[PDB]
Amino acid sequence: MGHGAEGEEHADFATVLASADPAAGEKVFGKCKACHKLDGNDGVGPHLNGVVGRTVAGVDGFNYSDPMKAHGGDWTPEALQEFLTNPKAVVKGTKMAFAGLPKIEDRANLIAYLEGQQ
Numbered sequence: 001m002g003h004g005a006e007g008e009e010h011a012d013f014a015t016v017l018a019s020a021d022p023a024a025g026e027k028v029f030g031k032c033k034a035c036h037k038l039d040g041n042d043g044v045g046p047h048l049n050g051v052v053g054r055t056v057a058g059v060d061g062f063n064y065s066d067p068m069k070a071h072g073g074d075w076t077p078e079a080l081q082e083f084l085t086n087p088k089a090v091v092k093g094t095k096m097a098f099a100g101l102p103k104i105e106d107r108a109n110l111i112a113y114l115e116g117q118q
């Protein structure tokens with residue numbers, strides 16, 4: 001629904017991830033560096049080095065939104081790619097102002113890169 005682009009030509013997310021390209025993910029992360037670092041520093045968003053498997057809303061000292069704090073669970077690869085599909089829909093009232101990664105391979109490639117940034 002709606003009059004914007006919605007097709008995907010590269011389409012089971014686990015299958016997409018298993019063949020992902022971490023160097024391509026390293027470039028997708030450029031879209032997140034204004035807010036997120038991979039050296040443990042926190043800023044507009046919390047650091048994302050070691051996010052894969054981390055408790056949701058877990059970074060010490062970072063002031064998360066109410067729906068993020070109340071969510072529970074961990075950032076598994078499925079959780080991460082669901083949230084990155086369209087943050088504002090997937091966690092209504094998130095404070096992350098990012099439109100999303102509609103390309104399924106961009107999500108899988110970005111998750112594969114974050115897996116190597118623990």
Ligand code: HEC
Nearest residue numbers: 031032035044045056057058064065068094095096097098
């Ligand atoms: C303009 C800022 C901005 C951009 C760009 C941004 N985030 Fe975020 N991000 C935030 C904020 C703010 C939060 C905290 C959201 C909340 O508390 O609801 C967050 C939370 C996250 C979380 C939850 C972390 C946790 O510790 O619970 C993940 C995962 C995340 N961003 C991933 C990404 C990725 C991957 C990108 C790039 C594709 C990205 N973000 C781009 C601002 C950004």
Ligand SMILES: [Zn+2]
Nearest residue numbers: 040047049050
């Ligand atoms: Zn950490």
Ligand SMILES: [Zn+2]
Nearest residue numbers: 058059060061
């Ligand atoms: Zn701690």
Ligand SMILES: [Zn+2]
Nearest residue numbers: 065066067069
């Ligand atoms: Zn509140």
Ligand SMILES: [Zn+2]
Nearest residue numbers: 071082090091
């Ligand atoms: Zn949820």
